């Protein structure tokens, strides 16, 4: 619904291109942090990560014109599918994204019963991450547990 113009937006892109202060077309904690430290001079070492992960609507690798474009324009996050396992889903979403890279696991899986050290939680999700794109997307969470 509604096709965003590439003309005006592109202008926003012109900034998003300089905003990268490199000419890569992707904003990551690397470049973003540089400015966030010399300009923003505040954002914690982990914040820019939470800031980047917060913009990772598509979470493909880093900040991109489209993902950053939406997050800047709107801020909606509906959901119409999670019928079952929706409880464990919120229980495992900890942060509040949908994927369990490790954070959620760490706290939830350590409080759930055992104590998955930073080693287990890291590797477990590394080997558990069926797709192995970099994180654990519910799509696999269910396809592995729910789906045969």
């Amino acid at each position: 619904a509604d096709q965003l113009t590439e003309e005006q937006i592109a202008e926003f892109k012109e900034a998003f291109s300089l905003f990268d202060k490199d000419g890569d077309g992707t904003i990551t904690t690397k470049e973003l942090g540089t400015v966030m430290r010399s300009l923003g001079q505040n954002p914690t070492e982990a914040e820019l990560q939470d800031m980047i992960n917060e913009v990772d609507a598509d979470g493909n690798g880093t900040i991109d014109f489209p993902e950053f474009l939406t997050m800047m324009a709107r801020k909606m996050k509906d959901t119409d599918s999670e019928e079952e396992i929706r409880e464990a889903f919120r229980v495992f979403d900890k942060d509040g994204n949908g994927y369990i890279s490790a954070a959620e696991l760490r706290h939830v899986m350590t409080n759930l019963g055992e104590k998955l050290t930073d080693e287990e939680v890291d590797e477990m999700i590394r080997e558990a991450d069926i797709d192995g794109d970099g994180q654990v997307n519910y799509e696999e969470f269910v396809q592995m547990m729910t789906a045969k």
Partner: peptide
């Protein structure tokens, strides 16, 4: 063996059995 599979899957299962 690999650690994880049927580990944290069972975790959730743990809850359900005794949600509280």
């Amino acid at each position: 063996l690999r650690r994880g599979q049927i580990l944290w899957f069972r975790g959730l299962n743990r809850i359900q059995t005794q949600i509280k």
